[PDB]
Design a protein around this ligand. Structure first.
Ligand SMILES: *[C@@H]1O[C@H](CO)[C@@H](O[C@@H]2O[C@H](CO)[C@@H](O[C@@H]3O[C@H](CO[C@H]4O[C@H](CO[C@H]5O[C@H](CO)[C@@H](O)[C@H](O)[C@@H]5O[C@H]5O[C@H](CO)[C@@H](O)[C@H](O)[C@@H]5O)[C@@H](O)[C@H](O)[C@@H]4O)[C@@H](O)[C@H](O[C@H]4O[C@H](CO)[C@@H](O)[C@H](O)[C@@H]4O[C@H]4O[C@H](CO)[C@@H](O)[C@H](O)[C@@H]4O[C@H]4O[C@H](CO)[C@@H](O)[C@H](O)[C@@H]4O)[C@@H]3O)[C@H](O)[C@H]2NC(C)=O)[C@H](O)[C@H]1NC(C)=O
Ligand SMILES: *[C@@H]1O[C@H](CO)[C@@H](O[C@@H]2O[C@H](CO)[C@@H](O[C@@H]3O[C@H](CO[C@H]4O[C@H](CO)[C@@H](O)[C@H](O)[C@@H]4O)[C@@H](O)[C@H](O[C@H]4O[C@H](CO)[C@@H](O)[C@H](O)[C@@H]4O)[C@@H]3O)[C@H](O)[C@H]2NC(C)=O)[C@H](O)[C@H]1NC(C)=O
Ligand SMILES: *[C@@H]1O[C@H](CO)[C@@H](O[C@@H]2O[C@H](CO)[C@@H](O[C@@H]3O[C@H](CO)[C@@H](O)[C@H](O)[C@@H]3O)[C@H](O)[C@H]2NC(C)=O)[C@H](O)[C@H]1NC(C)=O
Lengths: 127, 111, 51
């Protein structure tokens, strides 16, 4: 079984920023892409962005740019997801997701072959 | 984003057959077969049971199967039980350069 | 193939004439390439060697 962990549940004030984690192993971290989604509370989920673990290329949802940013380090080998402008209505379970294999001759970043999922990072905010 | 029109609930007694669909736009699925379906179950981590529209990853009963026609795809089902109740979702290719997901649905199988 | 999926951004230079330069690239920036089955190439190489 592949090893996969996020940062635990988090708490903020509305309008603040978040730094949710994902630190998997079992495969070399530059093998498969990393994806993030927002599981709404009683509504359909929404898609945030994807990581190329091997390069600085990034892409995010067409509605979430500016609100979301997301980076990675290789000294410790972990990637961090960020989101500004939190509200009480968007409090949700934020999931780390594994993408498709990384090929240098064709693009598979957007393939939704999500074989592995994190345990879920709940975030809730209050005044 | 287009929240694909999932029917919020289609169900009946155990052993029934249903088809969870979700429909979008001419541009999204008309050039790819990138569709996958997921599960949610009182708050636990999700499951992953169909991908590439009609392909099975591994530990999945073949009751679940895929279908496609133009702007819409579906998750075909036959032979349900109470354990099959879950929040099923569809997420597929949504243009440059991302995926988009539907409105969700609950299989309210009775009992 | 060229796996990039590029796009056309428009410019006007001087009066009533135009030239086009690639726009913002969609998706991951992969590498361009060709492919040849090594078996058919190799059978060709040895068929030319025997000659
Ligand atoms: C020009 O020419 C070039 C070639 O010269 C050509 O490029 C090639 O194209 C191929 C076709 O697209 C492409 O093939 C794909 O390969 C994928 C993976 O490749 C191999 O890797 C794995 C090895 O597994 C990893 O990870 C495990 C842990 O899981 C680990 O234990 C292993 O050790 C290994 O470790 C990693 O790190 C190592 C560190 O040293 C490293 O050495 C390893 O190499 C590795 O990086 C093997 O198991 C495979 O057999 C492959 O041999 C392969 O996954 C992929 O198939 C999937 O994608 C298809 C679409 O491309 C789908 O249609 C298909 O269904 C497959 O779907 C699986 O994967 C998804 C997730 O991506 C999953 O959701 C699915 O359910 C399914 O998973 C199934 O298995 C898992 C268990 O693994 C189950 O849990 C599931 O339930 C399923 O049963 C393709 O086959 C090839 O890579 C590429 N070559 C290169 C170099 O890029 C190019 O296209 C040509 N182009 C032109 C224009 O000419
Ligand atoms: C490779 O790269 C190309 C671009 O270089 C991508 O192609 C574009 O993909 C985007 C999706 O990211 C497409 O977006 C759609 O554009 C439509 C254009 O609308 C105008 O033109 C049409 C047709 O002429 C008119 O009918 C229309 O009235 C407009 O004048 C939009 O209308 C679409 O918006 C609607 O649908 C989306 C969902 O599909 C909804 O979210 C919107 O709210 C709205 O209801 C849509 O945005 C774009 O058309 C593509 N262009 C071309 C030239 O192909 C490829 O996707 C990319 N491929 C990969 C694999 O990365
Ligand atoms: C190549 O370099 C050029 C700069 O020389 C980049 O163009 C610049 O892109 C930025 C970011 O999009 C533009 O500024 C933005 O303007 C919006 C207005 O809505 C503002 O809200 C943003 O905060 C930001 O300031 C900038 O105008 C633009 N430069 C010019 C001359 O128009 C370009 O993006 C680079 N290429 C790539 C692929 O990134």
């Amino acid at each position: 079984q592949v090893q996969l962990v996020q940062s635990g549940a988090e708490v903020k004030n509305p309008g603040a920023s978040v730094k949710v984690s994902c630190a998997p192993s079992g495969y070399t971290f530059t093998d498969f892409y990393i994806h993030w989604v927002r599981l709404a509370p009683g509504q359909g989920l929404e898609w945030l962005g994807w990581m190329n673990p091997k390069t600085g290329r990034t892409n995010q949802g067409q509605n979430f740019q500016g609100r979301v940013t997301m980076t990675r380090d290789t000294s410790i080998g972990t990637a961090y997801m960020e989101l500004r402008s939190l509200t009480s209505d968007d409090t949700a379970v934020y999931y780390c997701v594994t993408g498709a294999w990384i090929s240098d001759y064709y693009d598979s970043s957007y393939y939704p072959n999500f074989d592995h999922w994190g345990q879920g990072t709940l975030v809730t905010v209050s005044s | 984003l287009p929240v694909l029109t999932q029917p919020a609930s289609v169900s009946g007694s155990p052993g029934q057959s249903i088809t969870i669909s979700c429909t979008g736009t001419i541009y999204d699925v008309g050039k790819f077969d990138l569709v996958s379906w997921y599960q949610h179950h009182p708050g636990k981590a999700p499951k992953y049971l169909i991908y590439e529209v009609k392909k099975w990853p591994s530990g999945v009963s073949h009751r679940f199967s895929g279908s496609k026609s133009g702007n819409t795809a579906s998750l075909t089902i036959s032979g349900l039980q109470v354990e099959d109740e879950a929040d099923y979702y569809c997420c597929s290719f949504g243009g440059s350069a991302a995926v988009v997901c539907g409105g969700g649905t609950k299989v309210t199988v009775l009992g | 193939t060229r796996p990039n999926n590029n796009t056309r951004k428009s410019v006007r230079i001087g009066p009533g004439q135009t030239f086009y330069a690639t726009g913002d690239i969609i998706g991951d920036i992969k590498q361009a390439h060709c492919n040849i089955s090594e078996e058919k190439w190799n059978d060709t190489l040895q068929k030319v060697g025997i000659e």
